[PDB]
Every structure is written in structure tokens, then in C-alpha cells.
Design an enzyme around this catalytic site. Structure first.
Site: not given
Ligand SMILES: *C(=N)[C@H](C[C@@H]1CCNC1=O)NC(=O)[C@H](CC(C)C)NC(=O)c1ccc(-c2cccc3nn(C)cc23)cc1
Ligand SMILES: *C(=N)[C@H](C[C@@H]1CCNC1=O)NC(=O)[C@H](CC(C)C)NC(=O)c1ccc(-c2cccc3nn(C)cc23)cc1
Lengths: 304, 304
Positions: A41, A143, A145
Site C-alpha cells: 500500500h 508511517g 508501516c
Molecule cells: C502504516 N503506515 C499504517 C499504520 C497504522 C496506521 C496508524 N497506526 C497503525 O497501526 N497503516 C495504515 O494506514 C493502514 C493502510 C491500509 C492497510 C491500506 N490502515 C489502517 O491501519 C486502518 C485500517 C482500518 C481502520 C478503521 C476502519 C473502520 C472503523 C475504524 N475504527 N477505528 C478505531 C479504526 C477503524 C483504521 C486504520
């Protein structure tokens, strides 16, 4: 003496962390030999992450759309390919700090050290256990990740985890170094739930051995039990089944302290149905299940 | 998100650890430039450590009685001198991995990372707070002496601690990098007692801010208090005085979370006279005083 949550020395892994920037998204990569590994991603925008097509996104990228930087020098991307949820970039230079490494897929209940990185630079290190529901309770900002989890065997760095996601409950999910997620999770900004978690029984008993080793002994009773009678009591408190393989891993610890494994089980059986009654174990009012038997021996024998 | 006990990346310190062997005693040294630092009881036998004369012992030693080894290469000792409880050996080679470093004497309540070493090789890393009675609750085996505590500022490694001793109560005592002990302890195998310990109040309030940052908020009440009224309540529970300097350090944290410092004090005042009533904060049934305000900002902002 003393007992602490201890992480592996992160020096070898530090020399492998690089910054990966595709367009505007920036995160961390793992540079071993002339190949850099990072979550796929990296190629998403903010708006693609809610339901991305990583195959589609990767088409429109040439080798030059990726900006890999180790320190204040740029590394030229010569090829790129995707393996499951992990991206792989071939660079024209192999990392001269590359250690002896292995790619392992760890089991639930095992621990590892997490090197939290941002912009390709380390910020801290801590220890994490892979939960029975295939999550980890980490500490990751935006960040982070690309940060990797690892274990060290003498000279060989065993990479086992790469951070990808935080679940709505605050826990974190990631993949191994082949792009394969731990558990039924997908790399997509959408609501996902982990399975109901359980307590790792073997890690609890090993933590009690470290307790006895360091002088905490008020919980040891005169009783013993059988393995089956312990399991029927432990499960109503959502403790993991104790199998013969498990008693066998606790073997050497039981030999160093002189306490039979099933004697310590009789003590844990009493702990769950009676509580601690105002007392603490290792300065903790709660039982702890994030110390494997190998972690305890390491701290109480000095593997180095 | 998430909050964990986090230690600094130990890579820079790893390149400075060497093994020191004088006769039969072996422990760890700190190799910066062409000078190696190690505890002076390297020169003792098992029988001298109960009441040693380090000046007498150091006379009968020439430069060749010291065996410094970095990896599988030997470093030739060219000079030697003692500074308080620390020995200093001049070697014919300066460490090519020497980082930018400083020698600081930290204050009680501050934290640092400990790189536990044995035979000049790292075994693990963890975080420690210097107690108000000038002890630290570490995890050290035999031969761990010479292990160093440190903090990292961007690129400069700030060394502040060197392990020397374990007290009868299980805690540990050491010196700075000038041979000066923290507290009223001496390097001698004899019974010594530390002063009665207190709870670091500022670190408790900073831990409550990390709690609010990560969603734990059941303890926040609608009340406020004055600084003096909080101190008279906190002291009967053996909490450290809160001064204006202390409120000033908590300032930026109070700004990020929107909670006034004295509002969080009113919440801590309620916590001490009422307990937690079956609830946990950050998954902990006890309050925690080993997270400085700077530690909290680092984990909740990513200093890197
Ligand atoms: C990596 N750079 C980053 C680290 C992650 C984000 C900040 N803290 C972490 O542990 N990973 C991401 O941004 C990642 C990107 C996807 C894999 C494309 N997304 C998430 O980590 C993420 C997924 C889901 C939600 C989410 C969704 C619905 C409801 C909800 N309620 N809470 C609380 C979180 C929710 C958030 C973030
Ligand atoms: C360093 N190599 C070593 C590390 C230290 C020993 C193992 N675990 C540690 O934390 N340091 C020493 O061996 C050190 C050497 C002196 C500075 C010359 N000695 C001690 O750490 C030590 C001091 C005092 C006692 C001691 C004395 C009387 C009663 C008593 N009851 N308990 C429990 C300990 C007692 C032991 C060890």
C-alpha cells in the site's frame, strides 16, 4: 537478578531499514541484499486505501516512481514485483550491512522484537507476542508501516513480521515477509474484527517460573494435579489448552527450579479460581502471558 | 496507536561494547575513541570483593594484565588509569564505530535504556527509571557489569549509567561514566540498604496523559484542584511533591490532550483515595511512574 520485558539488540536490523516513497505515500522498507521489501500500500493514495486494486495500481508504476533512500544517498530501483501483500524492489546496490537472515512464519503465542521506524529511521524497540487471534498489541503511529518484527539466533536475524494495519480495537495486524497476513485480515481501510482472544497458558506458567526464580513464591501450594484436570478448570477462564508438547517445552525450566510442571499447574489452577487476594507476582497485579519459555531461560541464563 | 515500554535503538551502543578480562574476572567495557571504560572491580579476585583496596590492586597490574577483545581481534592496552569507581584503559586503536557521545549525570525520575551485555556481546535491551532512592529495577546476571545505560538525542548517544552492583533487595546500583555512584553505595560485596523509595508523581501524570491519548478516560472527573491541595493529599500515599517546574514540563502534554495539568491532578487525587474499583488503566491494575513526560511525547509523536 530481576525480570523485565526485554527486546533483542536491534543493531543488525537498524542497518537494513530504508525509506520508501511512492508519489506522496512514505513508509519503511527492509533492505536485504539488493532487494527492498515494503507493504504494497505504498502505491496507494489516501483515497485508494478504502478499497484498493493493488494490481491495477502497480501497473501504472515504473521503476522510477519509487524513491528508496538509505541515509542521505538514493538507491536506484532496477526492478519491482509484488508477492502477496509485500512489494519487492530490486536495487542496483546490495546492502553492505546485510546480516545473515531467515524468513520464518511464527506460531501464535511466540514473541518477537519490534523495531518501530518512521521515515526509514528507527525510533524504538519493544517486545510483542503474536496473540491466539493473530493480532499483536503494539505501538505504531502513522508511517510506521514497513517496521519489522524479528528474533535473533546468535548471528542470524529471523524476520517474522511486517506491520500493515491497526484494527478498530487498537490492536495491530501484519504479514510475514512473503506478503501473507497473520489471520483473516486484508490490507484495506475497512472495519475488520479479530477473533475472540485467549490466554496463552504456557507463557503464564513460564512467567510463574521466572517468578519463582526471582524469589516470588507465595503462590506455590503443596498440591499436584493431572494435565486433564487442569485443562477443565483453565478453560472456563478462557485459558489455552495445555498439551504434552507444551509440558515438554516447559521441561528444562521445571528442571532448573526443581518444580514439576504439573505442580506449577496445580498452583495456576488455584490462582484462577481464587484470585491473588491482594498480592502481586513480579510487581504485577495481573497474570502475564507474553513471556515464552525461551524468553524466560534467556533472561535467567544469558544466551547473548 | 497503542502504548508500550519502549527502549532506544541500541545499534550505536552495540558497536562500542568490548570484553575486558583481568586475570580471571571478565566483564564488559565501553570503547569510545581509544579509551575503554569498565568497572574497576575487574581487577578483583572472588576473595578481594568483600573489602577491596582498588588502589593496592591496581598497582600490581601492568598494561598487559588487561585483555580487551572486540570480536575476534585483540586490542592492545597502552595505558591505564582509574577515575573514581571506573577504570580507563588507553588502547592503540580508536573505535571506528565510535558515535557522537556525551557523559551526563541524570536526575532521579528520569529514564534510560539499558543494553544488557555478557562477554562483551549484547543480550537484550530494556528501559529503566532512576528511582528517587538512586537505584534502578533492572535485570542483570553475573558478568553483566560494564553494561551501560543511555539516551539518544538524534545522533548523539548520552551515556549516563554503568552497572556495578545488586542490592540485597534485588534492585541494582551503578555509577555514571566518571566513576561516581548514584546514591550512597560503594563497590564492595557487603550488605547495603537504599533509602525508602517514593512514587515519581510527574511520571504518573504523564502516564495518565498517554492513557487519555489512547482512549482510557474513565478516571477523568469534572473537578479541578490547586497545586498545594494536591500535594497534601498525595504525600500521605508517598507521592513525590509536585512543583511548578513539574507542571511546566507537563505543559506541552496538557496542550495536546486539552486537559489542564491541575485537572489531571484532581483526577489523580481521586485515584489515590478511592482506588481503581476493579478497573485498569492501559491494561494495568497499578499506577505506573516509569514513563517521563518526554517518553510519552516520543511514543505519541514519533521523534525518530
Ligand atoms: C502504516 N503506515 C499504517 C499504520 C497504522 C496506521 C496508524 N497506526 C497503525 O497501526 N497503516 C495504515 O494506514 C493502514 C493502510 C491500509 C492497510 C491500506 N490502515 C489502517 O491501519 C486502518 C485500517 C482500518 C481502520 C478503521 C476502519 C473502520 C472503523 C475504524 N475504527 N477505528 C478505531 C479504526 C477503524 C483504521 C486504520
Ligand atoms: C557484575 N559483574 C556483578 C553484577 C551483579 C552481580 C550479579 N547480578 C548483579 O546485578 N556485580 C557484582 O558482582 C558486584 C561486585 C562488587 C561491586 C565488587 N557485587 C554485587 O553485586 C553484590 C553485592 C552485595 C551482595 C550482598 C551482600 C550481603 C547480603 C546480601 N543479600 N543479598 C540478596 C545480596 C547480598 C550481593 C552481590
Amino acid at each position: 537478578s530481576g525480570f523485565r520485558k526485554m527486546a533483542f539488540p536491534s543493531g543488525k536490523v537498524e542497518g537494513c531499514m530504508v525509506q520508501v516513497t511512492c508519489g506522496t505515500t512514505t513508509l519503511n522498507g527492509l533492505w536485504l541484499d539488493d532487494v527492498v521489501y515494503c507493504p504494497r500500500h505504498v502505491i496507494c493514495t489516501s483515497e485508494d486505501m478504502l478499497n484498493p486494486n493493488y494490481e491495477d495500481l502497480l501497473i501504472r508504476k515504473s521503476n522510477h516512481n519509487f524513491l528508496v533512500q538509505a541515509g542521505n544517498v538514493q538507491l536506484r530501483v532496477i526492478g519491482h514485483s509484488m508477492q502477496n501483500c509485500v512489494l519487492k524492489l530490486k536495487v542496483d546496490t546490495a546492502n553492505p550491512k546485510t546480516p545473515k537472515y531467515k524468513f520464518v512464519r511464527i506460531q501464535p503465542g511466540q514473541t518477537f522484537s519490534v523495531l518501530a521506524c518512521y521515515n526509514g529511521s528507527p525510533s524504538g524497540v519493544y517486545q510483542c507476542a503474536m496473540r491466539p487471534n493473530f493480532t499483536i498489541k503494539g505501538s505504531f503511529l502513522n508511517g510506521s508501516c514497513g517496521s519489522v518484527g524479528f528474533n535473533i539466533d546468535y548471528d542470524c536475524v529471523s524476520f517474522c513480521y511486517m506491520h500493515h494495519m491497526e484494527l478498530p480495537t487498537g490492536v495491530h495486524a501484519g504479514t510475514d515477509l512473503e506478503g501473507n497476513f497473520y489471520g483473516p485480515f486484508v490490507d484495506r481501510q475497512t472495519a475488520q474484527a479479530a477473533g475472540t482472544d485467549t490466554t496463552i497458558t504456557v507463557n503464564v506458567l513460564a512467567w510463574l517460573y521466572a517468578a519463582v526464580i526471582n524469589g516470588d513464591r507465595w503462590f506455590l501450594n503443596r498440591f499436584t494435579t493431572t494435565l486433564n484436570d487442569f485443562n477443565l478448570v483453565a478453560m472456563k477462564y478462557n485459558y489455552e489448552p495445555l498439551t504434552q508438547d507444551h509440558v515438554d517445552i516447559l521441561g528444562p525450566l521445571s528442571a532448573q527450579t526443581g518444580i514439576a510442571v504439573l505442580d506449577m499447574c496445580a498452583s495456576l489452577k488455584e490462582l484462577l479460581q481464587n484470585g491473588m487476594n491482594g498480592r502481586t507476582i513480579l510487581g504485577s497485579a495481573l497474570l502475564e502471558d507474553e513471556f515464552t519459555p525461551f524468553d524466560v531461560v534467556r533472561q535467567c541464563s544469558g544466551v547473548t
